[PDB]
Design a protein around this ligand. Structure first.
Ligand SMILES: COC(=O)[C@H]1CCCC1=O
Length: 113
């Protein structure tokens, strides 16, 4: 399947134990996809002061279309020192590893895999 329905746990930035996926744009996109596939991926909603508390490169989910079965269609865009690799819509949040943090909510997405 080109798209996979996922329910992503929404985490508070201060709860996040593992604050990024790795050390290169290509590694963070790889790791983000593996965690999304393995159900070990969380989402942090981007507000004032969030991104400086997380590790670059960042992996964003961005809205890729204007929402089957409640699931917003999204794709991955990485960012490192103000340059983005990919082009998409509005940020739904920044992905991080999930290692058992308690979420505040769930974000239903259809991920272009
Ligand atoms: C069924 O596979 C999945 O869960 C997706 C996640 C991203 C890659 C993939 O195969």
């Amino acid at each position: 399947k080109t798209h996979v329905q996922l329910s992503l746990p929404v985490l508070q930035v201060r709860d996040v134990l593992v604050r990024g996926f790795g050390d290169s744009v290509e590694e963070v996109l790889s790791e983000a996809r593996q965690h999304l596939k393995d159900g070990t991926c969380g989402l942090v909603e981007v507000e004032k002061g969030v991104l400086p508390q997380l590790e670059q490169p960042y992996v964003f989910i961005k809205r890729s279309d204007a929402a089957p079965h409640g699931h917003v269609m999204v794709e991955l865009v990485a960012e490192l020192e103000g340059i983005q690799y990919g082009r998409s819509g509005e940020t739904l949040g920044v992905l991080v590893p999930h290692v058992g943090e308690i979420p505040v909510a769930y974000r239903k997405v259809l991920l272009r895999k």
